[PDB]
Write a protein that binds this ligand. Structure first.
Ligand SMILES: O=C(O)CCCCCCc1ccccc1
Lengths: 171, 171
């Protein structure tokens, strides 16, 4: 109910996620991948990271009135990937130009003057490979940083310099 | 063989592991996977689990004189996979008949009265799919309990029950 899934992802129900009401779909295979940071509190355990994903979703749903947490996936410093909207549902991370053509993944915390531990970066790339494997991402997939497509500081000076070293990253 | 490397694994250096002195290799592709528990302390965090891996390698090397932590991989309740001897190197987990033909996976903890969390189970299972995709395991590969191939309680009643439900399990 219903998992044989992939790159070890914590499912919605596991992090006590309110149900999603979002219906719009993404046409896979998908082209772009946007990396952002939540700009929120960071966590480094599964217990604290479950709570943080829960907290981010709540702010998005109760306060901004969105159908679900905005990101397709969330990455905690505990080294785990948190299921947001998933591979199929259009996200709300990068504005209306990019939300229907990209998969937004978000690192939990502020990474302006901080860096995510390797395990988080590992989970992230693994997450991405796991995407292609399923057909959601297209192998040619390109990684853009949040600030490359929107006036924002996200994902942070420090995380942004790292993702530039990634092999699939295009400016 | 196949460029696309698989899954997330915490590398030896990251959990501060003593250099291995172990040299006997396994013949790819391995047919059997044997699941054990450590019957030791459990840890739920990246930090506390790295320590535990260290404690276990320590005890195997310093007190029992093995060339390396005996298991090929360890699984923590933090939902992470810790690297041991790896895919290509014979371990010291299940006796001499079995060590040369199987892969040893141990869950860090005593799973007699406790089941490991879903995230632990997810990593263990994902790890195996990675083995198959990498070519280190046989697509048909068979999972066995430690107690099926040795007189032992490992991997613990609770955990034993669970692995019996895996589709690759054969007693
Ligand atoms: O783990 C890997 O990277 C190799 C491929 C594993 C993909 C998950 C297997 C699966 C996918 C969809 C439905 C059931 C199982």
């Amino acid at each position: 109910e219903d998992p044989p899934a992939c790159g070890s992802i914590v499912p919605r129900r596991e992090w006590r996620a309110l149900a999603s009401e979002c219906r719009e779909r993404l046409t896979r295979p998908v082209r772009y991948v946007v990396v952002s940071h939540t700009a929120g509190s960071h966590c480094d355990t599964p217990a604290s990271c479950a709570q943080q994903a829960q907290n981010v979703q709540s702010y998005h749903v109760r306060n901004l009135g969105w159908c679900d947490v905005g990101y397709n996936f969330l990455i905690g410093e505990d080294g785990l990937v948190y299921e947001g909207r998933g591979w199929n549902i259009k996200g709300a991370h990068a504005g209306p130009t990019w939300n229907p053509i990209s998969i937004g993944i978000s690192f939990m915390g502020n990474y302006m003057n901080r860096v995510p531990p390797p395990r988080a970066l590992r989970a992230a790339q693994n997450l991405l490979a796991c995407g292609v494997a399923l057909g959601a991402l297209r192998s040619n997939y390109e990684v853009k940083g949040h600030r490359d497509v929107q006036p924002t500081l996200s994902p942070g000076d420090r995380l942004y310099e790292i993702i530039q070293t990634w092999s699939h990253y295009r400016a």
